[PDB]
Amino acid sequence: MKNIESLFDYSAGQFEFIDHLLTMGVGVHFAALIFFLVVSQFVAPKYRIATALSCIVMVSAGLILNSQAVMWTDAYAYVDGSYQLQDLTFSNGYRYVNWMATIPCLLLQLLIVLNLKGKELFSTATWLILAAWGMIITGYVGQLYEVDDIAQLMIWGAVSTAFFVVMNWIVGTKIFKNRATMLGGTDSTITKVFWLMMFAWTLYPIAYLVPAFMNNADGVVLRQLLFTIADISSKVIYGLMITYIAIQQSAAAGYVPAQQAL
Template identity: 65%
Template sequence: MNNIENIYSYTASQFEAIDHLLTMGVGAHIAALVFFLIVSRFVSPRYRIATALSCVVMVSAGLILFSQAQLWTEAFAYNASTELYELQQLTFSNGFRYVNWMVTIPCLLVQLLIVLGIGRQQIFKDAAKLILAAWGMIITGYIGQLYEVSDISQLMIWGAISTVFFVVLLYIVGMRVGKLRHSMPAPTNNTIMTVFVVILFAWTLYPIAYLIPYLATGAEGVVTRQLLFTVADVTSKVIYGIMITYIAVHRSASEGYEPAMEVIGRDGYRDQVNA
């Protein structure tokens, strides 16, 4: 019973709210997967790996959310005498999310480096730094959430350590985006800044959800945490992936990739390439 979800009982509306949030997350990732598969043919080979990584993220995150939704409905059962959903022998765990983030966050970071147009050697160097920072952030956060029921002080200590890795990660990403955005063709130079804002917004929701055992108590706090997780998942993976693909298509068009120029329908790109 490492997660606070397992120490409360839920009204029908609270239980269904969490069930619907998890199901919505699954649906959003499946729909986005179909979108990325269709659009990938409009992305030049140089940037197509970024869209392919979006597909990997959608499958990985979608499967985890599906298992979370199944686990939620199996862990609790309705008690007619109390009119509450109560924990059964099987417990619910958010730990699976952390395992999933070990896969998806490196993919998201590599996508960003690719559409920034960084050279191959530099991508490997930057990716190594970012992935190590991401794994440090995730592993220490995973350890901390194991204490959210038994020892809030340990939750806070490990959360602080995780935050150090988080700040380092954001600093590296911000420096790269700030340095290279001016070399990107319009309108992608503005879009990449929006991508960074999306990262700041969505990834900040995760530590807030992590702190819910400290910030809020009761079943309402659990609903709030699952809401934060869902908004963060959809924003940081689905919306982020769409924006990355948008940049990849426009960069492909600016470099003369015919399918990209056709789908965008901008003669300006043809004039730019022919010049």
């Protein structure tokens, strides 16, 4: 009852559209999990953990979209021509707790294909995960108030975006200082991966703000549409490119399974 979803009745079309976005989301992630599984054999040992983390992200994200889709259909019932709330079982908080695990996985695979290792891998990962967790936690607290205190949503949103800015400055500094280490021509590819990250990750703040500029049932639909665009791009497309870089660098490094697959 702390999220705006609880404030509205939905038409069958709005409800069915939301249910379809979530179920379609589950399908995409599990279908890509198999891709990442099958291509791990074509990735050198040095980079294989990068594709394994993609598998982890797929299942983690797929289970939570699956969970949301079922919570969505348990929470509402078609009564008198509309879908009305029946039980307190749907909430976007589940997305936030899940980012605590999936965002580190997405960051760690980027550092691995950057060829960071040892001391600098450990320290860089620690500061990035610490900052990402401060982004998520302050964001989590803030969205508890999207119904009751929109001013406090904005202030937690401002504290969260400060970690977001610092976190991306670390990522960008590491990519642009290490892109000359990369092989197979992937110095060019990693930069686009960074701009794709910038685009897809920034959609989550927009969805976070929907309650402020569109607190209605159509805003609920839009927010889930934006999560779905962002999920597919920050997890699946991003994963495909990370796996591409991993196999190309494997091939340029003398890994024959990688050379034959390409």
